[PDB]
Amino acid sequence: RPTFYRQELNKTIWEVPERYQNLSPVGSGAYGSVCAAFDTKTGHRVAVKKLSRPFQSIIHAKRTYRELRLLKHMKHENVIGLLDVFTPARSLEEFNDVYLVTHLMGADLNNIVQKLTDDHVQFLIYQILRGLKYIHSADIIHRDLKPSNLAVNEDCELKILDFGLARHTDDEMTGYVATRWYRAPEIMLNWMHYNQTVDIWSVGCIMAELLTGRTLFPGTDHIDQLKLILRLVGTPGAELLKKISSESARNYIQSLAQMPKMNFANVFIGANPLAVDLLEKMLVLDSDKRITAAQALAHAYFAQYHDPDDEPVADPYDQSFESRDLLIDEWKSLTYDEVISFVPPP
Numbered sequence: 632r633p634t635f636y637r638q639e640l641n642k643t644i645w646e647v648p649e650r651y652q653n654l655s656p657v658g659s660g661a662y663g664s665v666c667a668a669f670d671t672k673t674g675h676r677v678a679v680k681k682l683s684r685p686f687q688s689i690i691h692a693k694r695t696y697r698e699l700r701l702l703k704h705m706k707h708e709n710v711i712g713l714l715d716v717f718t719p720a721r722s723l724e725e726f727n728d729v730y731l732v733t734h735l736m737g738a739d740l741n742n743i744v745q746k747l748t749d750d751h752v753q754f755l756i757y758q759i760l761r762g763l764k765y766i767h768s769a770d771i772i773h774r775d776l777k778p779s780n781l782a783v784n785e786d787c788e789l790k791i792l793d794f795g796l797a798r799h800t801d802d803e804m805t806g807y808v809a810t811r812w813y814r815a816p817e818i819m820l821n822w823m824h825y826n827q828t829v830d831i832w833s834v835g836c837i838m839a840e841l842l843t844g845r846t847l848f849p850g851t852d853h854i855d856q857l858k859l860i861l862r863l864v865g866t867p868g869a870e871l872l873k874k875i876s877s878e879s880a881r882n883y884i885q886s887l888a889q890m891p892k893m894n895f896a897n898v899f900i901g902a903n904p905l906a907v908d909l910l911e912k913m914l915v916l917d918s919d920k921r922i923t924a925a926q927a928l929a930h931a932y933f934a935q936y937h938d939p940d941d942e943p944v945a946d947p948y949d950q951s952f953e954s955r956d957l958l959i960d961e962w963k964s965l966t967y968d969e970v971i972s973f974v975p976p977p
């Protein structure tokens with residue numbers, strides 16, 4: 632066990648191993664209570680997150696377990712990974728705080744998206760799809776890909792963030808808000824049981840915005856946003872209508888006058904024809920028919936970066952706990968086991 636020291640940060644007393652020095656608050660609070668630090672063991676600048684009230688309720692205790700399980704599993708160059716996890720507690724009975732350590736990531740894709748060449752768009756979207764192929768191979772659905780969840784460095788290298796945090800609330804999704812502009816229509820409107828294909832819609836929205844400098848579907852509310860979507864991709868045909876299992880939602884969408892899909896070469900004026908082709912394959916209303924991440928990596932738009940021997944998949948991820956009902960102290964004991972069993976990367 633390392634020696635720990637105490638310091639007052641972010642309105643509480645932080646207690647951390649001596650290896651972490653020069654702690655200072657960082658960020659806007661989006662991912663929790665976070666401080667930057669220098670890790671003297673590795674030489675890395677790191678982010679240290681101290682969870683607030685991780686076990687106050689069943690929902691909070693299970694969410695804490697979920698975040699730790701997901702972060703411990705992710706081992707890929709284009710996905711956030713866990714450098715360390717620690718608690719000052721010496722036993723389960725005194726366990727009450729969890730600290731998570733990752734690489735410090737200053738800028739996100741907003742902070743860049745600058746004059747982006749087509750070569751830049753190729754490299755950025757390639758890296759998102761490489762990470763997504765890995766995530767999806769573990770049967771994990773991201774659900775919230777958007778520019779603020781994509782960390783990028785000075786060499787254009789990218790990592791995907793946002794695993795195991797609280798589900799977004801109805802109020803967070805209301806109005807003229809970026810948290811809804813990237814969502815697939817079937818999840819925005821609860822049309823049907825959704826699956827991993829929601830994430831490919833989000834990638835299409837991001838790619839369009841890198842190419843034009845403008846939000847693709849900046850709706851002022853759910854209904855305005857649906858109208859923007861259907862104007863570009865067309866109103867649904869009978870085949871998709873059958874798959875909308877919500878009778879109410881199916882009835883509303885039939886109240887709208889029918890519209891054909893637009894010509895994407897006339898929407899994305901001047902863009903690489905291979906980029907136009909890929910956008911047409913991602914932004915398909917029927918999710919069954921969208922291109923997958925593994926298929927998209929082989930598209931000719933990425934010919935300069937694609938290497939099928941360097942696009943790895945994930946070890947299997949058991950998420951049977953998601954359907955399990957346990958008491959607070961049982962989720963807490965599972966979390967403690969995962970803290971003490973952590974093995975750091977090479």
Ligand SMILES: NC(=O)c1ccc2c(c1)CCCO2
Binds near residue numbers: 792
């Ligand atoms: N769960 C996440 O996706 C996530 C994102 C950022 C982040 C952390 C965790 C912990 C260290 C601070 O920064």
Ligand SMILES: [Cl-]
Binds near residue numbers: 713
């Ligand atoms: Cl990482």
Ligand SMILES: [Cl-]
Binds near residue numbers: 718720726729
């Ligand atoms: Cl503790």
Ligand SMILES: [Cl-]
Binds near residue numbers: 741
């Ligand atoms: Cl964003």
Ligand SMILES: [Cl-]
Binds near residue numbers: 774775797798799
């Ligand atoms: Cl969500």
Ligand SMILES: [Mg+2]
Binds near residue numbers: 775793796799
């Ligand atoms: Mg989110």
